[PDB]
Symmetry: none
Subunit: 285 residues, 4 copies
């Protein structure tokens, strides 16, 4: 037997393996990585480490060989068309190695989405289907870790959380809750050919965040929403690179449209109760 995790030294990937070794011996987990030495700490724990590179098809056969269950995590690249080619090659290699279950990290409510990245994941889910391998589509929400972290200290002393998200509702969940979801699916039965939209059923807004921030800190914080340009400017003024700031402005702009505003019980049915936003604020200070 054998469970493989791509993106293993990535943030989601790493957590899946940590959660995985609660349920299975490390000798049953395979970490697939493009620079093996940077996974040395996982090799130390007995997890087998393999070289795999979405960008080099010639690398994948040996990465997937003999594996029963594959956690296929989408590539971090932001060239969407490129992502298609990469994923398509991952899927073909998984097919040829004779993998028995593919779990894929896609996008929640992708059929309704207003963003080209949704089409990447949709294309990939269809790619996985041609394969005939039993599948699980793990359509992860945005990470809460992204908005709830160190950086909110600035907002504490500034008095403001600045975004371009307007009154947008956010269905985000912690990276850790999503990782546990993945790990659960890989280690118990009944998830074959299932599509899960893994989001919060207790959504929030940035006025809420400002408000919870005020309570758990002590200083008042308001949410000052602004334009796409003004927010890209805000972060630039404070040392964040322009491409990185396009991304963050991208995420917020999407939020303001309804992109993170649909909910589901899928994740809660899977992992039990979610971590409240307030507790996640505390586990950040």
């Amino acid at each position: 037997f054998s469970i493989a995790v791509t993106g293993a030294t990535g943030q989601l990937g790493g957590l899946v393996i940590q959660h995985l070794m609660a349920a299975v011996p490390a000798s049953q987990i395979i970490a697939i990585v493009r620079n093996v030495e940077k996974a040395s700490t996982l090799a130390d724990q007995g997890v087998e480490v393999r070289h795999g590179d979405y960008n080099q098809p010639e690398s994948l056969q040996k990465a997937f060989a003999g594996v029963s269950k594959l956690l296929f995590i989408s590539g971090p690249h932001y060239d969407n068309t490129l992502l298609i080619v990469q994923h398509a090659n991952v899927v073909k290699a998984a097919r040829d190695a004779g993998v028995k279950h593919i779990a894929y990290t896609g996008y929640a409510f992708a059929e309704e989405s207003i963003i080209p990245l949704a089409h990447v994941h949709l294309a990939t889910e269809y790619a996985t289907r041609t394969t005939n391998i039993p599948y699980t589509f793990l359509r992860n929400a945005l990470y809460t870790d992204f908005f709830v972290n160190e950086g909110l200290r600035a907002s504490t002393e500034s008095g403001a959380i600045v975004t371009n998200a307007g009154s947008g509702i956010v269905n985000s969940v912690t990276r850790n809750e999503l990782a546990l979801a993945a790990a659960t699916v890989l280690t118990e039965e009944g998830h074959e050919n299932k599509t899960y939209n893994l989001v919060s059923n207790q959504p929030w807004t940035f006025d809420e965040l400002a408000q919870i921030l005020s309570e758990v800190s002590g200083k008042k914080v308001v949410h000052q929403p602004v334009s796409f340009e003004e927010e890209k400017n805000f972060m630039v003024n404070a040392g964040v690179p322009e491409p990185f700031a396009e991304i963050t402005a991208a995420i917020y702009d999407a939020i303001s449209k309804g992109e993170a505003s649909k909910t589901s019980d899928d994740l809660q049915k899977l992992i039990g109760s979610l971590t409240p936003l307030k507790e996640t604020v505390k586990q950040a200070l």
Copy 2:
């Protein structure tokens, strides 16, 4: 200015170019092909031939350089998962080359389909959506030529068309007509970002095919619905390849389940009058 056609030595591609020449000078037509000598007959008519193979990304970069409009004819291979890699290569190369308009031969009513190939077409559509290049999804019906061909001669004096298509309905159109649709779209305004389900609004049954056979030919020909392993017999036990005989038997089976039973006016609004079934039966004899 230039219009390119992949698959240009195959039956559909070949017919598209013929229609295209009725509308625009040959110097405006680029034929893209796996074998460049096996198309000299196209070069004689003054049509620019270029080499392009879907397994070779670099071949496609060069093949697509400078094209305004691309007719991306779907790949013929039997390995669906391969086809996804190929199609993703083609899509990336068109994006890279700055193609201004992309038309793709997909599959009619693909979302409701029970045929694996449909997942290929859907993945490819999503990959195309990804590039933001104006697109026309030419969702082609099954070919009428597939059922109405040389092999009806062999049914005639025998006295029976033998299929496992049960009593299912068929909305097939000829390659010629679909080629006209393709050529028509490349050739006039107003087809950008459109999805057309290109089928017949005069469907027919296999029992009806028999009647039309008798009507035109010598004697009594009947339909003879069989099992679908029983069909492999009247095929594999008569000198036919075992993957190919499977392909056909799984089409009939889909047909017996209503795969080809739904219709649309899209094609007729695009090209006008459709070719009566009886016409095509004569023509294939």
Copy 3:
């Protein structure tokens, strides 16, 4: 007589050409780049720009034709093993073209190093040795500009420089200084068959950096050493893309282990007095 520079649009390469232009007529400098159209401003000023791609032996035969002295700037790729293949191609093309002197940007104190990238540079240095072409191994330190850049405003504002570098010593020097060294070696005599460890003889630590950033800015800034995992999580979470956060953390991890802690006089002897840390910080602001 020709001096060619690879990576001439990259940051080191560009500055080398600036310096070469101060010492020789433009008609004697050749720029080698992946994208010649983007380097057109060099051509406007009279610098021949030639296409060179390390994966492409044929591209390099033409880039290197008739060149007297070559500055071979090492590849940016992340695949160390591909990097050896690429560098081997460069070397063999330089040999075949009868290049009369090769300068190569390697890695200081590589024999002592604990980082796979060091093996690439040593392999490359041996490859060059095989050609018998007189050589100069310009073994460059990490760039000061990687740590001291306007990105430090983030730390000014937040009151902390967060690294996983611990109290590791940093022997970095500026890009400009290395570029100057490269240009000096190509335009004067007495550097043939020499190896130079081009690092600082006045190294610093992040605690020092934090103290200088204090004095310069006005605000209080401390250094905050965290774990490898903590740093990755900190950046990924602050908008930094995961492959790039991985690079920064690895660099930091190396520094903490003494990877940048050895010093030398080589650079100072080549170019004169070095720029103080204080000055680059003022400069970054």
Copy 4:
């Protein structure tokens, strides 16, 4: 499971394979060769034969597919810079194919050597280090048969062995014994990440070779040591093309400087006692 041997058609690799057959079933041995039909004799023995060509990356991907242990025998060419390219391709295909263990035939005490080939081997060792595959560096001595061969008839006839090796001591080893070492390392545990300097612990001089040649031939033979330039002239006059004359003269010159004068017990500990020089002389004639 499997062990593959490159250069499987050369002398060293052919020897290795004969040895490996004393140890494993023939089905377990893959012979990788430039010309498959030219290796029918091996096929006959039950050894799997695969096409592999150091100049063709694609061949090596397919050749190394699924192999556990690879013995990578260095290229026989005398163009050192080409060797680097060829070697780098082998290293990358091995890396890509996930070979589990790579043994490489380098050159004993390479870092101390003054002869050109040593740089090739050094470069290859570094390339292999970058792949992170468990390795064995089989650093071979000069081959005994480079000096002790059929060409020694010239010296019996002439009365003299003419070299420019002066009084240099020689630690060379027969190819057969180096092949047995390789076979041993590949069929037993404990050689992962090891470097062996595989030389003789019973070295010899040319004066001695001369005296053994007199015992065996019954005719008086003396060593006549001469200068570098005289050896080149001697050989060219014997018909040896000048490029191979350089190579030979440079080997002897190096011997006269102590290059083959250090010994190690690595080989003896690996295979037992060595073949006496006298036996090799009798066998050569």
